[PDB]
Ligand binder design. Structure first.
Ligand SMILES: Cc1nc2c(=O)[nH]c(=O)nc-2n(C[C@H](O)[C@H](O)[C@H](O)CO)c1C
Lengths: 158, 158, 157, 165, 158
């Protein structure tokens, strides 16, 4: 099917580590959502320092929007995790992915998983469409489409 | 046992990555359910973009069906995950698996675990019964049988 | 100590993959509870197809028993998982284990962890007391004993 | 300045009732861990008649057993202020070690909000017997010290510092 | 953006193992928050015996604070875990990280993840800024900056 996002308000909340890669992911989510009809002033962008802040950050972002009379239909937390020499990578990835999944029932809208969990920087670049070789595609576009489809097919109105 | 599936309504909801494999798994579940007496018109199929979308999809899918007076007796979320070069496979698989298990208590019907979590494409083909050498069998068929058994034996009425 | 099991009703519910190992585990559980005085007619056995079905099957098994006025005091879900070549073993094991643990607080009775999580068939056989060399005691027996002790010592009464 | 700096003070255990509940596999290790936790708490002023000991067959039983232990103690007017569940797990050749450890750890952690008292993590998760003997202060070489004593101290401190009163 | 922390009350609660590294992490968080404007008299430091005690110590820390009329706006649990030769490291780290993440909804303030999960003491010293060759930076500072931002941006009040 072809999903029309013209009636949606979408939230994007991103972490600020690996900023270049973050900015490419967020751009591709935006471009793709506009392409499917979401209005520009209905894409709300918020930020937090690290990926661990994404879930509580997303919950409070959604509550704040609802309280001011501008509820989100869907949220895309975006973060980039690259394995370092410690186990920090594993513990942030694990607890964050699980809390992003469990957030959906707290706030009652879908939440799109926009975390990269890469072993290398180069893998993160390819997944954002910004490697030298352009060897894959920008995953942020996948997240934008999925946000439009999940909000449309499964929103309260559906 | 023989379980009479003629009274059941059953939802299938599938991700849309690895589509050829998905269709074969889906087709396997439907056929087996049809052979246990489930009626063609009582099998409802829905889709989501990726495996991470399955659990919230499945929740909203059940709620929607109940709300129009057509409640699902059991749901079979289906996705195919194949290990790539980052840890995205691990983190999707594990959070999606836990969310599928836990969904059962939120919607009060059995949810059949229809995710493949393969290290290679070929393992995934074999488990959909469509590798060149037909070395295994279509797991879809197992999911289909299990959906009818779990709905019947453990359905809201004994 | 000796735990008297004569007043207990115990449910065993088991998956059906690896049936020979399953039957040996269930028989050891039942034999040990018989010898702890649990009565034969108060041992109720149910099945499910796969280990993944154990936690929701056990919940509805307990509910149904309570609803017909024959509540279980304790339940033993039993399944046999053997590592294969995909990660399916790991995901089933991890999510089934945690859900068996979390089940206790929902149905308010102990639930005995009767799940083998083996890398080979021969490990599973051994843990059922039926490998060729008889290298280990049947773990089903321990599950039977644990069910009687947990129900007796930690039961509502 | 802030709330901080380092004083290393003792905590008085004398108003406390403490529960220790232990698995029965690897009994010799278990007995040494328990004795150490009891000894250290007696040294901190917990009275002998206020240390309650209970057992369960294996480590997987520690979480629900600890819950029902604390509920029973409260129902007879003898509430626990803190519980120490103790078990010894040693890697075997299947993945049983890992599934039991992980789901037991997580349920000891989660148990605290249900019964509303601290729960000290008294589980050994060792790759070898030797590792477990050492952390109970009973290897040949006495290479370490009895982690049991740390659990007893940790219990007295958590109950005292963070108790309802 | 620039954050004004002058209205904030922040709790720091640290384990006792690897005290020298804990102390450096804690001073880095305090120094950072001071420079963001938090006042000294509004920073409260508590201690627990080990990393395992952080989540429940944090919960009770926040509840005691609120009950005497001085509620925290954010809490920063700090611990330093180093792999040893048993699986103790993995079990503490995993259950502690997940419980710190999940604490946030129980006490309704953000909780910054101040655990080091290091393979070696050397990694830990580097991440508290006190290794011999000063190779990284004091991560306690990122935590302080995170506490101020999450509290300001996502606090109950605004
Ligand atoms: C072995 C060990 N290692 C650490 C560590 O590296 N860092 C730390 O902060 N705490 C450790 N602990 C203590 C546990 O976190 C906890 O206090 C005990 O197991 C009692 O619950 C223990 C027990």
């Amino acid at each position: 099917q072809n999903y029309d996002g013209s009636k949606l308000r979408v939230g994007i909340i991103h972490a600020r580590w690996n900023r270049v890669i973050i900015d490419a992911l967020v751009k591709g989510a935006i471009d793709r959502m506009l392409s499917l009809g979401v209005k520009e002033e209905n894409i709300i962008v918020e930020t937090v320092p690290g990926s661990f802040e994404l879930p509580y950050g997303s919950k409070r972002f959604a509550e704040k929007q609802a309280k001011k009379g501008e509820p989100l239909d869907v949220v895309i937390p975006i973060g980039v995790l690259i394995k370092g020499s410690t186990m920090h990578f594993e513990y942030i990835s694990d607890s964050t992915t699980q809390a992003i999944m469990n957030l959906q029932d707290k706030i009652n809208i879908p939440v799109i998983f926009g975390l990269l969990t890469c072993l290398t920087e180069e893998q993160a670049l390819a997944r954002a469409g910004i490697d030298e070789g352009k060897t894959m595609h920008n995953h942020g576009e996948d997240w934008g489409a999925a946000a439009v489809e999940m909000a449309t097919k499964f929103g309260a109105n559906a």
